[PDB]
Each structure stands twice: as C-alpha cells, then as structure tokens.
Amino acid sequence: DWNNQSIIKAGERQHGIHIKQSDGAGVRTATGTTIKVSGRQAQGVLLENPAAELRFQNGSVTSSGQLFDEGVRRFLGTVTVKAGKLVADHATLANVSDTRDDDGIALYVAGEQAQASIADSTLQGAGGVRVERGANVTVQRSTIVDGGLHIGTLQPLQPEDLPPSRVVLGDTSVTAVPASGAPAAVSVFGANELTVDGGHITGGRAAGVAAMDGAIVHLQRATIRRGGWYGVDVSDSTVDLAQSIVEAPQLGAAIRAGRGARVTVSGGSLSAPHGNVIETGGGARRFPPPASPLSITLQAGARAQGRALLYRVLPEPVKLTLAGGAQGQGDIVATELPPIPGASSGPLDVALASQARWTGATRAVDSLSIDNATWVMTDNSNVGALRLASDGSVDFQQPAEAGRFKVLMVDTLAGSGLFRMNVFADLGLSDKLVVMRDASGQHRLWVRNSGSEPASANTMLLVQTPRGSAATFTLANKDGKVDIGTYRYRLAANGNGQWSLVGAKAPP
Amino acid sequence: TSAWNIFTSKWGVVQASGCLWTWGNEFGGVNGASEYTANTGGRGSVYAQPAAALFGGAWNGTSLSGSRAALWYSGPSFSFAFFGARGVCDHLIL
Amino acid sequence: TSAWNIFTSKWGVVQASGCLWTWGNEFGGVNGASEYTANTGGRGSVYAQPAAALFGGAWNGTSLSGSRAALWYSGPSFSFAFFGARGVCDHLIL
Ligand SMILES: [Mg+2]
C-alpha cells in the first residue's frame, strides 16, 4: 500500500498514518516508508481500528510534537495502537522533544484489542515503551534505548476494573538512562504479565525491575545491572528468576520483596559485594490473617553472594528457602529494634533442603530447619528452634586463627542431624553447642582436630542441654573415638545433659 | 522500675515521656498501601496513607524515650496499648 | 445518582464529601522526583516533594468517599476537575 515514500507532516495534529475507527476493515502494509511528524499533538502512526492490521517494514517513524490526549490526561506515544494489530520489522521508532513538555513515549499499546509485535526494531525517547489496559505485545531482537518498559499503572484516580496485559520479550535489551528520570528500567503494576527470555535489562533510578500490586513476572536468562539501587523490587506479586544474573552496588540489594511477595530464583546468580542479597520490608501493609508470608526460594543450583544473604526489615514475617543444591553465602540480619516496642512480630524462618548450602552466621533467625543440607557456620550464632533430618548438618567452619572457637546457641533442638565441631586439644578448648530451653532426638558429633599435640589428657565440654533433656549424642568419628597425638578421646554425657569429650592415654 | 516524677517536665507536664506514646498531629514517615483501603472505622478509604506521628516513647522503650522521641511508622488506624494522647491548645491573651 | 443533601454534615457543611476532593493543608504520602524540579509556576524548584493531602473523595469516587477519605498521591502542582477546596479558620472568643 505505501512504498518508499516520505510522508512528513509538520501539520499540527496531522498524523503520518492514521487508520480511522470505521475506515476499511482489512490488511494495510508499508515498506521503506520513513515518517516524520513535527506537528504538536500528532503521532507518527495512530492505529484505532479493531479490524485493521498495519505492517511496517524497513521504515522509520519519528515525531517531535508534544503528544498527549485529554482523555484522562495521559500522554500518548509516537506510535499508538488503541485497536488493531501492529507488525514492526526492522524499524526505528523515535520521539524527540522536551522533559517538561513531552514524556517521549516511543510506543504505546492500550486497550482490549490493541496488539503489537516489534521485531528487530529499535525504540527511543525518554518515555520508552508503554503498555496497558488489556493490550498484548511481543518484542523480539529489539532495543529500548533510553526510556524503559512500563506495563500498567496504579490508580488513575478511579477503580481498576480488570483485563490483564501480556508482554513477551525475545532477547531484546531494555535500558533506562539516568537522564530519562524513569524510576525503574522495567516496571509492572497491577494484574499484568511479563515474560522475558534473555536480554540485558539495565538502568532504573531506584530498581531494575519493579513488580507491584499483583504482577506476574517471569525473567529467564535475563541479566540485570545498574549502569540505594535494587535489582528486582516486588510487592504483593510473583517473580521468577531462571538462569538470570543480578548485580547490585554497595548501597543496595539484588532483591527487595515485601508485602506478601513470592520470589523464586532457579539457577542463575545474585551478587551484592558490599550490600544485601535479599531485603524484606519498607512499605507497611498490616493484616492479622497470615496471608502469603512473603517467601523467597533459591533453588536448582542458584548462586548468591553478599555481605548479608538476607536483611530483614523488621515486623514482616519471612520464609527463606535454599533447596535443589543452591548455595548462598551471606549473613542474615534483622534491624535489632522493632518499630513498636511490645507488639507481635512474626518469625524469620529459613529452610535448608535437598542438597543446599548456606554459609554464614546469624543471631536473627527464628526457626532454622536443615534437611539433607548443610549450614556452614562462620561465626557465633543464635537460632530459636533448630530442627534436623536426613543427614542435615551444621558444619562449624575451621578457624584460620588457632584457639578461636565458635559457639552456637539454640532455644530448642529436635529431629536428627550431624554437627562438625573444632577441637583444640593442647589448649583444652572446643566449639560448643548450647541448647537453652528444650533438646530432643538423636544427634551426631564429628570432631575435627584443629590444635594438635596435647600435654596431658583433658576433658572439653561440647554440648549443653537443659535439666534431664531427652537428647542423645554420639561421637561420629569412626569407632566412636578420635586420636589426637598419643591420646584417645570419647564422648561421655555427665550429670544434667552435659556432653564432654573425656579421653586418656591411647592403648599401646 | 523508675518513679513517675522522674518524667515531669519543666512546666509540670506529668509523665511527659517514656510512659505512653502520645499520638501527634503531623503526618509523614512510612506510607501504607499505594491502593485504596477502607480502614477508617467505615468512613471512607485511604491511599498511600502516611504514618501519623507518635511522641515521647512508652514505658517499655528504655533508651529510646524522651522529649524528642519520635515514631513515624504507625498508620492512623493502628491501635495499641502503648498509644494514648495528650491535648494542647493555643494561649489566648486579651 | 444521589441528592446534594445526602452529603450534608452534622454542622451543615454542604456537599461535605463524595463530591470534590478538597485540597488539605498537610504533606505526606507519595513523593515526587528526587531532583530539583521547577513546577511551581515559575517561583522556584522542589526537591523530593511530598504529595498534598486531598480529603472527602469526589463524585466518581464510589464508595471510597466519606468523612475520612484521604488521597496522598497528588503533588501540589497537579490539577484536575475533581480537585477543589473548602476553607477553615479558628474560632475567636472574646
Ligand atoms: Mg502539619
């Protein structure tokens, strides 16, 4: 229909190509047809027909005019689809204007019948791509140069009715330049879906990805960098991270989630060299019913490193889970003081499962459960309820400083697990495990020699438990003994649940 | 653990601080849901509702309490047994 | 769909709620651009500007409206055809 033309309309409110709401009901098409509209309040392309399909190839649609409608004062984009299908192939969509005057929206798809499939194209202007109000978009092998991607919004001063927006991305790369003002490089507000498959999400003033008020975001093989900033920021909505990579500066966190958020990280990697890997809270929503106590899961071999593995903002409950051989090294901290002295605070619960491995230290975790996994404990620690199962272990890490023992304090102990512990025989000192309220189940201690050659044979306290506790311990070093130089030690429980390591001169 | 008169202002305000937070008449601090919530004793809905200040500290914030102690977390619809109020009004000279 | 006198207050405030948002004299809620923006009609710039309160709800508001309906989203430079104002002042006794 349109071939190699040069439609330029400096004419004000004069649209490069416009398809009337009741125009022809069929397939349009345009090749090599570069467009420019300087006319104020006039887009390069406006599609408005629920029956018309526009195909735009090897062209270039650009506008300089200050675009925006006064149908509830929302500022359109240099190409706007309100009804019908748009197919873009190798196209440039640009929007040059002002900061205060125009938003600079390059592409705008809104409405229950608005469709777009951008392929091999590139989009620019400090407003980026905006989708909302029941629209469907698919973007492949493309670039959002400076304005970012934004699906849905919050309350436009009235009731949000329903119909979800769906957006799919095939390795494109979304950027949001500091200049563009945009708070997050990619953002999804409301009951809307975004599937990302590969690409570079980079930018955001505050975050890389923001999902809030009930979004569903599936990020797959994406990579997320800045270029206090957060990698991913969630709310009361679902975010899935498959084989993605997320880096964060000192002042930030790789993930922030709060208000009943649900985060799953499988495979991939999250680093925060001087900050937190995961942050919880900062945006209060208090309801007495235990809704979906905000939960994070690192599974399927996920890697996660930082100064702390989890920082809790206080007075929301959290459920951290390392499973499927995931490994996270950090620290897990809370705020020490609650905001309201004398009120209910729920628990900080971590669950280490199927082959996983947290390496760090804590005095913030309310209830830790290791099960066929290992907590490599790096320093003195405090846990409320400890529970083990199926070879769950708590490996006290071997100190580099000789003589430096570590102590784990626990409120209650249950189930059945293994504890690797360090022993300094020449000094008569050892790691200790103290249980303060209640102990029970069959546990195993494995002793590591870390201060060799003892002058005499000397007893060393290993485990402390209450009154007449029900807990049994057994020395797991083979034959129930450890030979430290010319001395043999065995474990003996003495008086009120106090398991020491006795030993004397080894049989000749 | 300490007597009431330890908390008596220069002006004879009794239990000035660290006995009960008084609600304030200033808003700011931590906001609630950025979305309409009907939590106002059934008299309309709030949106991005900021915290309503609390002053002085209560009996159980030991070191935290005092004449400048201030908590900007609680939404105005919050209710606790550490939250009361102290009245003020202008001074009129005629 | 409701008569004007449905929204008449105990003290005869006419159209008290559910007709227009009235601008409030309180700041809090959603902040704006954390950089100096000039949107004060040519009278200087604002940094990290907190929303101005709006009370009562408007005609569109549905069931959000009421004596305590409060919206902390709009900046002092925003304008809309459902944003009005009501006046108040002190009581003088002599
Ligand atoms: Mg004030």
Chain A nearest C-alpha distance from B59 (Å):
9
Task: Tell me the technique behind this structure.
Answer: X-ray
The percent of chain B in helix, strand and coil, each rounded to the nearest 5, is 5, 25, 70
Tell me whether residues B48 and C17 touch, CB distance under 8 A: no
- The Cα-based distances of A352 to A319, A324, A386, A387, A504 in angstroms read 11, 9, 11, 10, 38
Nearest Cα neighbor of A173 from A194, A192, A197, A157 is: A197
The residues, ordered by sequence, that sit 6+ positions from A191 with a Cβ below 8 Å of its Cβ are: A152, A162, A164, A213, A214, A215
Q: Are strands A381-389 and A348-352 parallel, antiparallel or unpaired?
A: unpaired
Residue in A154, A283, A342 nearest the CB of B31: A283
Is residue B81 less than 8 Å (CB to CB) from chain A?
yes
CA distance A338 to B58: 14
CA distance A270 to A263: 13
The percent of chain A in helix, strand and coil, each rounded to the nearest 5, is 0, 50, 45
CA distance B19 to B15: 6
CA distance A37 to A32: 16
Residue whose entry in the numeric block shows the structure tokens 């190699």: A4
Is the sign of the CA dihedral A280, A235, A181, A249 positive or negative?
positive
Judged on CB neighbours under 10 Å (0-12, 13-18, 19+), C19 is: buried
User: What total number of domains does chain A contain?
Assistant: 1
Range of the domain at A291: 1-508
CB A61 within 8 A of CB A33: no
CA distance A364 to A379: 13
Residue of A nearest to B82 (CA): A342
CB atoms inside a 10 Å sphere around CB A401:
6
Local structure of residue C92 (DSSP, 8 states): P
CA distance C13 to A193: 46
Local structure of residue A112 (DSSP, 8 states): T
The number of angstroms, rounded, from the C-alpha of A389 to the middle of its chain's C-alpha atoms is 28
* Test the A interface: residue of B39, B46, B73, B80 with most A CBs within 10 Å: B73
CA distance B44 to A433: 55
User: How is residue A181 written in tokens?
Assistant: 């003002």
User: How is residue B67 written in tokens?
Assistant: 């004449």
Q: Kindly report the CATH number assigned to the domain that includes residue A224.
A: 2.160.20.20
- The Cα-based distances of A164 to A110, A167, A190 in angstroms read 11, 10, 8
Q: Phi/psi of residue A505, each to 5°?
A: -50, 130
Local structure of residue A437 (DSSP, 8 states): E
User: How is residue B15 written in tokens?
Assistant: 């239990």
Chain C nearest C-alpha distance from B54 (Å):
15
* Test the B interface: residue of A287, A340, A344 with most B CBs within 10 Å: A340
CA distance B16 to B58: 10
Chain B nearest C-alpha distance from C41 (Å):
25
Judged on CB neighbours under 10 Å (0-12, 13-18, 19+), B68 is: exposed
Local structure of residue A398 (DSSP, 8 states): P
The number of angstroms, rounded, from the C-alpha of A143 to the middle of its chain's C-alpha atoms is 24
The residues, ordered by sequence, that sit 6+ positions from A271 with a Cβ below 8 Å of its Cβ are: A246, A247, A248, A254, A277, A304, A305, A306
Tell me whether residues A285 and B61 touch, CB distance under 8 A: no
CB A116 within 8 A of CB A154: no
Nearest Cα neighbor of A327 from A301, A360, A308, A309 is: A301
Judged on CB neighbours under 10 Å (0-12, 13-18, 19+), A53 is: middle
Amino acid at C26: E
Q: Phi/psi of residue A197, each to 5°?
A: -125, 95
Amino acid at A413: L
Is residue A157 less than 8 Å (CB to CB) from chain C?
yes
Chain A nearest C-alpha distance from C9 (Å):
24
Q: How far is the CA of B82 from the centre of ligand 1 (A)?
A: 23
B-chain residues near C66 (CB < 8 A): 40, 42-45
* Test the B interface: residue of C71, C90, C92 with most B CBs within 10 Å: C71
Angle at A419 between CA A415 and CA A421, to 5 degrees: 160
Strand ranges inside A7-96, DSSP E = 17-19, 30-31, 34-37, 45-57, 60-63, 79-89, 92-95
Q: Phi/psi of residue A180, each to 5°?
A: -75, -5
Angle at A235 between CA A230 and CA A238, to 5 degrees: 100
Judged on CB neighbours under 10 Å (0-12, 13-18, 19+), C44 is: exposed
User: How is residue A132 written in tokens?
Assistant: 């909302």
Q: Are strands A149-151 and A184-189 parallel, antiparallel or unpaired?
A: parallel
CB atoms inside a 10 Å sphere around CB A485:
13
Subunits next to C (3 or more Cβ pairs <8 Å) are A, B
